[PDB]
């Protein structure tokens, strides 16, 4: 049950009242994940899903929130008999974690769109019997906290969620699905995925949350979207204030994606007296380097996106090259398609559009153009090099001829005299290639008119030209 001290701030009449509740719960040894998710889901429902009747803020009455809370705890306590799963050493068993996962899973509506907005919270679970993938993982952790299972915690990659538990928190269990059309692995470890060096499991350099980081997860999970063209200003402000609360308390230190989210929010609407977006993006990169062996892609993606939006071509190219330098040490595996799509879109859409505008501006007499900067040409080359090296050793290939036309066009946006300045140096501006594909392509990179046909042959598996 909710404790008297958890009840005293209600009713919550404003954004700032919600923030005060989060501050009060974060001052406890176990912030109450169920309470906090239900509150966020309630206000997100009445600020983004149905704004009918809204005049300022959807007041959250204790009676309403307590009844939702009681529905959740009744449904978990009645379905999970702890006596069947004795806790050896004050830690949980795999069978207990599987049972909790089953209880959440089996509660969900039989058929619904899993990609929908606003199905992340326990409010969605109780009122609509709908959750998205990571929403199930979070709900399992919240259920385990409600049961007294202090060792069960959320684990997060850049594209998936599961749990850690057990002796020293060293066990892993799948508790939800990943993507669409993949085979369920609920109950199993993540060790096969770690051992195959897929992006999905980050080579083991994934987040292992404490309770405070689980609060940060639900705050990052707030979705201000009303429709394709409209966000709730109220929810953006709430999320931003909550992220700064977490930041000040130290709970974003090990959470690169939260730092990126906060930077994005500051770019939209800066908070006076706070660090700039750029500072925050760089903090997210530093966090990844410090705590995650520099094995995360999104810290660089977030930075590159900022530079791209600000048409800072040099800076954007540098950050995408840095992205590619991370991915090069992975193997491209069967459930890694989201990061393939990101690299494909950068190479084959975003970079081409950026360089097309840069070429028009150069024609109009721009100075200091990325297209006249050999260091920028080197960043483009390093981006392709890391993608080629990623492909090496991978069970599934990355490149194909549909990449080749965009490579030739992008290369060609730099005049030959600029391209000539980069010295490509071998182990055993200056650039070293890691990939064999780019090493073989070196020869082709300085001609006044690039040999398109030869580039295509070198980038792809094709080794012959047409017969006739």
Author numbering: 2 to 53, 74 to 386, 399 to 461, 549 to 588
What does the paper say about this structure?
pmcMenin, a 67 kDa protein encoded by the MEN1 (Multiple Endocrine Neoplasia 1) gene, is a chromatin adaptor protein that interacts with MLL1 (Mixed Lineage Leukemia 1, also known as KMT2A) to regulate the expression of multiple genes, including HOXA cluster genes. MBM1 binds to the central cavity of menin, utilizing Phe9, Pro10, and Pro13 as energetic hotspots, which occupy well-defined hydrophobic pockets, and positively charged arginine residues (Arg8 and Arg12) that are involved in electrostatic interactions with the negatively charged binding site on menin.
We also solved the crystal structures of these menin mutants, showing no structural changes in the MLL1 binding site on menin. We found that point mutations in menin do not change the protein structure and only minimally perturb menin residues surrounding the MBM1 binding site. On the contrary, biochemical studies showed that M327I and T349M mutations in menin have a relatively minor impact on the affinity of MLL1 binding. Our structural analysis clearly shows that all these point mutations exhibit a steric clash with the menin inhibitor Revumenib, overlapping with inhibitor fragments that extend beyond the Pro13 binding pocket on menin.
